[PDB]
Amino acid sequence: EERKKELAKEVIETAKKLIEKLAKEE
């Protein structure tokens, strides 16, 4: 995978982890 696309996908994966925590903790 092209690196800049990969970095954008890593942004999404990290924000998804944050969404998981927010839901766990609400």
Numbering used by the authors: 1 to 26
Question: What did the paper state?
Answer:
Several natural systems exhibit ‘facilitated dissociation’, in which an effector (E) can bind to a target–host (TH) complex to form an excited ternary complex (THE)20–26 from which the target dissociates quickly. We set out to design protein systems that undergo facilitated dissociation. We use a switchable target binder (host) and a flexible effector that can rapidly bind to and switch the target–host complex to induce a large steric clash with the target, forming a strained excited ternary complex. We show here that by explicitly considering excited intermediate states when designing coupled protein systems, a broad range of facilitated dissociation systems can be designed.
Because state Y clashes with the target, this conformational change is slow when the target is bound, limiting the rate of effector association and the overall rate of facilitated dissociation. This slow step could be bypassed if the effector could instead first bind to state X and accelerate the transition to state Y. An induced-fit mechanism could provide the driving force: an intrinsically disordered effector could weakly engage with state X, and fold and make more extensive interactions in the strained ternary complex in state Y35, driving the transition in a power-stroke-like motion. The two effectors make nearly identical interactions with AS1, but when unbound, the peptide is disordered whereas the 3hb is structured. In contrast to this induced-fit mechanism of the flexible effector, we find that a rigid effector provides reduced rate acceleration even though it binds more tightly. In kinesin and other biological systems, it is difficult to directly assess the role of flexibility and folding upon binding in overall function; by contrast, our designed model systems allow the direct comparison of flexible and rigid effectors and show that the former yield faster conformational transitions against loads.
